[PDB]
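Notebook entry, structure prediction.
Reason for the run: the old model in the group folder had no record of what sequence produced it. Starting over properly, with the input documented here first.
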Amino acid sequence: LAASLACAL
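New structure, fully documented this time:
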C-alpha cells in the first residue's frame, strides 16, 4: 500500500 501511494504521486 505505501509504495502504491508514492508511485501514484
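Summary: The chain is about 80% helix and 0% strand.
The old model has been moved to the deprecated folder.
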